[PDB]
Structure 1
Amino acid sequence: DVLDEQLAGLAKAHPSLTLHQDPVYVTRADAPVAGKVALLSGGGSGHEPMHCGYIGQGMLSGACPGEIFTSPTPDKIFECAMQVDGGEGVLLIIKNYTGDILNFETATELLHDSGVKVTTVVIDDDVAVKDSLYTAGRRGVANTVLIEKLVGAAAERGDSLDACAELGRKLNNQGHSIGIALGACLADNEMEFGVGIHGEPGIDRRPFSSLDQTVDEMFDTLLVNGSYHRTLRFWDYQQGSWQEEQQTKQPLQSGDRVIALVNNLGATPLSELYGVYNRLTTRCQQAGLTIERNLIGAYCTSLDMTGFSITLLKVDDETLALWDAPVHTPALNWGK
């Protein structure tokens, strides 16, 4: 089994991680870490390093990879949550896809019934399409990485489950993403505009003229598709039931301070991502957006798809302090 070989490789390469079997999931070698909220996510394999490369201090306590582009089953999520539970509750970050919501929601209920204090955060940052192939609402993509880091920092500093959940939901309402593909993981000089991370169709197929023009279209779309009202359910652990909550996003606007993530979907040369970033900085400056921090590289991929995404997340001083906080994971590492 190739997936078995890949996870074995991950484990051998990173002694800070523990690979579990029966069922398979990955945790920090030091979990459970007593006295801190534990943070967990997961989803299909094929988006590496999301989510296993984000396991470590200041980020995820553990993650649950599934088969390629397929959500992990509920047993994996339940066992991973039980293993990382430090007695202060477990926060589940769930990307918005039919399969992930179903499986993570089922695990949430199993956890609650086993006495674990748990709650959830749903990620729906992809501004391209409402009601895609495998999503009710908007797709969860690269902003998931930014939210994992920020909520990770808050959990590491000792914030409560409620505080971490509330921060995650607020960040979700302030982050906006869009991706394009020049080739699947199929048209020649044409791009799939607003593509999804498991290959879902975008807004349309349109001609690729240049990098700068593609970035302009992506950026313009982030500015005009920002406004969004929708229901996102979260687990209320006090009542032991799903709570329907109306959630609102405001469009990105002049005067906003943002973190920018220019993300390789798989086979885009890093030199090109820097070209993207150069045009993005120009457009942000023209629109009154101040990019305060950035990440450029392969953070939320789709196998070997040729393409990239842009994520802009609105932030303030407190959120920037959470960004600057230490993180020690395979894919992201910085100290004070």
Structure 2
Amino acid sequence: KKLINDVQDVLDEQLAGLAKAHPSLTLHQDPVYVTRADAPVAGKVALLSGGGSGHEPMHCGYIGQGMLSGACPGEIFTSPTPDKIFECAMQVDGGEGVLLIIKNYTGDILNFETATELLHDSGVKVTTVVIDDDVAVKDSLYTAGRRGVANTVLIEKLVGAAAERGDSLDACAELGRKLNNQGHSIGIALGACTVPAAGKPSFTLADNEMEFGVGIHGEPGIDRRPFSSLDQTVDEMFDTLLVNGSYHRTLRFWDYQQGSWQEEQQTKQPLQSGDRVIALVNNLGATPLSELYGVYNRLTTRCQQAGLTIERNLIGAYCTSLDMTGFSITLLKVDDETLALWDAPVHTPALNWG
């Protein structure tokens, strides 16, 4: 049961609605991508992201002043192909370079890496930010690292304010990478999503089961455990953020000066007493907004007990998984300079403040 017409047409119809609804956005065709109406903006770093459809408002909802210059939607839960990304970046280059924000998945990484090389060869100054905030990893053989989830939104906003303020390409990439090392996420599901071309949900769950450590692509989580109460659920999530906070991994970034990928080992420290944070209680798609307030209520108690100070918050549907019933919690460690970037103007379909 989905509000769609023909299955071949679902995205054409939804992107048509997006363009008609938002005069500040330009829907480009052949290939299809979205940019701010006034892109390219001369003399500022352009910010680009993209990924599968089915995460609305991520990413097209974040295109506008103080956030993304453009976004490349793909098929449902499928990365965009290098051609969209190439053309989108060429469309938004304002003479100061383009920063690509890439969520850590195999498809996304491959496609965005391919476009990056293609761009550099056409003389576009470009570098990259990889997001890998989801702390839930199944104990098995593999490989893919940590997934990029809701902290992508917070980094997009903070790096967007830096770009808009007029920071250089390198300063913007450096902030994005630093913030990646300081943001932590975990998601749960009480019910699965259904992809239009399915006719049945991603997975099934008994009435007393939750899927713990879930992504954004409808995938089952790292395991099935009992669902007992909101407080218990929030408590296991918050505890996991702490115990899985420490993380060492190899990441690649495009070095445009040398025309090659620079590998780096990077370390995340866990959140500690005394840290100041931005909290995102993110709807995965079909949870009542009221329940998210109940989650926020418990989250503040656990933060207070652990010595964490929530400085700012976002509560709502910011990075979704179609019609999945569940939510995620993201905590991102900030300071005075980062808070000032948060409070800066943003004028997008999904986030607006002045």
TM-score normalised by the shorter chain: which range applies? Answer: over 0.9
Query: After superposition, what is the alpha-carbon deviation per residue over 1:39-84, rounded to whole angstroms, capped at 9, x for unaligned?
Result: 0000000000000000000000000000000000000000000000
Q: Tell me the CA shift for residue 136 of structure 1.
A: 1.4
The unaligned stretches of length 5 or more in structure 2 are 1-8, 194-204
Check conservation: 2:138, 2:222, Cα contact below 8 A: no
Check conservation: 2:27, 2:35, Cα contact below 8 A: yes
Q: Tell me the CA shift for residue 202 of structure 1.
A: 1.9
Check conservation: 1:142, 1:299, Cα contact below 8 A: yes
**Counterpart Cα distance in 1 of 2:340 and 2:317:** 24
**Counterpart Cα distance in 1 of 2:233 and 2:132:** 23
Output aligned runs, 1:109-148, within 5 Å.
109-129=117-137, 136-148=144-156
Output aligned runs, 1:179-328, within 5 Å.
179-185=187-193, 186-328=205-347
State which of 44, 55, 68 in structure 1 corresponds to 2:52.
Answer: 44
Cα pair distance change 1:135/1:10, threshold 3 Å = farther
Partner in structure 2 of residue 88 of structure 1:
96
Check conservation: 2:62, 2:350, Cα contact below 8 A: yes
Q: Tell me the CA shift for residue 320 of structure 1.
A: 0.3
Query: After superposition, what is the alpha-carbon deviation per residue over 1:196-245, rounded to whole angstroms, capped at 9, x for unaligned?
Result: 11022322100110111100010000011000000110000000000101
**Counterpart Cα distance in 1 of 2:140 and 2:180:** 19
Check conservation: 2:33, 2:71, Cα contact below 8 A: yes
Query: After superposition, what is the alpha-carbon deviation per residue over 1:99-155, rounded to whole angstroms, capped at 9, x for unaligned?
Result: 000000000000000000000000000000168899711000000000000000000
Cα pair distance change 1:322/1:133, threshold 3 Å = farther
Check conservation: 1:132, 1:200, Cα contact below 8 A: no
Check conservation: 1:65, 1:71, Cα contact below 8 A: yes
Query: After superposition, what is the alpha-carbon deviation per residue over 1:286-326, rounded to whole angstroms, capped at 9, x for unaligned?
Result: 00000000000000000000000000000000000000000
Cα pair distance change 1:135/1:329, threshold 3 Å = farther
**Counterpart Cα distance in 2 of 1:33 and 1:138:** 33
Q: Give the SS at the match of 1:131.
A: coil
Cα pair distance change 1:148/1:135, threshold 3 Å = farther
Q: Tell me the CA shift for residue 188 of structure 1.
A: 1.9
The farther-off stretch of 124-133 and 176-185 is 124-133
**Counterpart Cα distance in 2 of 1:146 and 1:253:** 20
Q: TM-score, normalised by structure 2?
A: 0.93
Cα pair distance change 1:66/1:147, threshold 3 Å = same
Cα pair distance change 1:46/1:207, threshold 3 Å = same
Cα pair distance change 1:33/1:6, threshold 3 Å = same
Check conservation: 1:225, 1:251, Cα contact below 8 A: yes
Check conservation: 1:131, 1:137, Cα contact below 8 A: no
**Counterpart Cα distance in 2 of 1:101 and 1:277:** 33
Task: Report how many residues are paired.
Answer: 335
Q: Give the SS at the match of 2:83.
A: helix
Cα pair distance change 1:130/1:206, threshold 3 Å = closer
Cα pair distance change 1:273/1:66, threshold 3 Å = same
Query: After superposition, what is the alpha-carbon deviation per residue over 1:16-55, rounded to whole angstroms, capped at 9, x for unaligned?
Result: 0000000000000000000000000000000000000000
**Counterpart Cα distance in 2 of 1:50 and 1:79:** 20
Query: After superposition, what is the alpha-carbon deviation per residue over 1:153-191, rounded to whole angstroms, capped at 9, x for unaligned?
Result: 000000000000000000000000000000100222200
Check conservation: 1:97, 1:135, Cα contact below 8 A: no
The unaligned stretches of length 5 or more in structure 1 are none
Q: TM-score, normalised by structure 1?
A: 0.98
Check conservation: 1:215, 1:276, Cα contact below 8 A: yes
